Amino acid sequence: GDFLVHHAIALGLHTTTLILVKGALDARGSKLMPDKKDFGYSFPCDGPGRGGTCDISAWDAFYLAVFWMLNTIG
Amino acid sequence: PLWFASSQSLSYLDGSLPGDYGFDPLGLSDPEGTGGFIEPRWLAYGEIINGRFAMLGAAGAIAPEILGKAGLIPAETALPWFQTGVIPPAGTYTYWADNYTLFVLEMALMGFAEHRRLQDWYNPGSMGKQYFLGLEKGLAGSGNPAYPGGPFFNPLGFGKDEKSLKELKLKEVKNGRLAMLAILGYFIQGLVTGVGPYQNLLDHLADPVNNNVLTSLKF
């Protein structure tokens, strides 16, 4: 009974780490927006162009990882 | 002579058809907007065919009863048209073969005839080309689908003159309409009264006031 729970805990840790690491590494720029560092740490979006860019900042990455942290601790 | 003619009906009914009294309240034969089975020519062709079949049926549904009452046919054979096996719940008779076998044979022969008729209707002269045991010479047709003519269909050579042909066509159309009405009357009388049409006629001639539509429906 502990095997599956331990693997679920590992899955939660891995997913939260993935979200936070991607948010930290892709902060300065990416292909969708190569000048992300000019706008700042927190900004709403970059408009509907290029197919739509919502939740593009790193503040949104922390925002999304909070839920996974809560679920893992639960 | 116009019967219930309207302004719309008189536009396309030019009188160049047998039995044209200009009666068409619903505009079914209206010239434009034609497709599928609704067309000015197909309706006339179907009317002619239905009239001919109705004449045949009207003669045949009454001949056996007349012969039986006159004593010219065995009694076990003279039956009302609904007791000959057409409606098994109403009655049945024993023939030389099973009823469904008779239906299969009739369907085969009628399909053989009607497919050729339809192929004439589609292609006018195509039915006189392929080998049909030599009978294909006489099935060429005259170009009019409703009146093919030829040795097989007009052996007696009637209607050579155009005026006589028109008179005969008018007579045929009127007789076909009368026979269709008679067949509908046969159906309704058989459904309501429950006895043969000749029996109804004899009962009415016996006492005109005692036997009528009100008698069967009382009041």
Binding site: - | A97, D98, Y100, D120, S126, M127
Partner: protein, 203 residues
């Protein structure tokens, strides 16, 4: 062009010309629009015709001879149930290998028209056929009735094709009659001929 067709007064399809033997322009579903499909269908039809002719003969001869007192062979439907000198699986395997060799040779002939005309073991023996589906040679045409004028060849091919179609219909009729009624085909024929009216499918 002016040949008789299946439905008089109709227009035969464009991909059916009439050069092929037994051509009547009957293809309402358009199953052979592609030429390769036409070749494959022709080969399949020829093979089916020959196999069904053999099957119809082997079904209807022993039954008729059993109706008379000459033979005592059992019913064709119960032939596989009986016991033989070997298990059915062994006979099936041997037949599978034997027929598979010949079917592989025929497939190689179909794919490439002229690659299997020589005897692999002895190079002296050859097959004289020049048309796909008609192997010819001394093995499959010892009497020499095959090669000849194009008109006679077409007439013979049409005869064979029509006989094969009739045989296919015969075998399927025998199968369905046996499963439905439950008696030999000769018995059904005699019973129907005795009373043509009542003794029919509607019974």
């Amino acid at each position: 062009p002016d040949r008789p067709i299946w439905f008089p007064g109709s227009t035969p399809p464009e991909w059916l010309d009439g050069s092929l033997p037994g051509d009547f322009g009957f293809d309402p579903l358009g199953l052979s629009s592609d030429p390769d499909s036409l070749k494959w269908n022709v080969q399949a039809e020829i093979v089916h015709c020959r196999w069904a002719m053999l099957g119809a003969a082997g079904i209807f001869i022993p039954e008729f001879l059993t109706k008379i007192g000459i033979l005592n062979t059992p019913s064709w439907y119960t032939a596989g149930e009986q016991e033989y000198f070997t298990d059915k699986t062994t006979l099936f395997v041997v037949e599978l290998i034997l027929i598979g060799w010949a079917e592989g040779r025929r497939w190689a002939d179909i794919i490439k028209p002229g690659s299997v005309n020589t005897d692999p073991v002895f190079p002296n023996n050859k097959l004289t056929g020049t048309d796909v589906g008609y192997p010819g040679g001394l093995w499959f045409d010892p009497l020499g009735w095959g090669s000849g004028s194009p008109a006679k060849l077409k007439e013979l091919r049409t005869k064979e094709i029509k006989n094969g179609r009739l045989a296919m219909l015969a075998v399927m009729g025998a199968w369905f009659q046996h499963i439905y009624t439950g008696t030999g085909p000769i018995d059904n024929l005699f019973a129907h001929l005795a009373d043509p009216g009542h003794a029919t499918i509607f019974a």
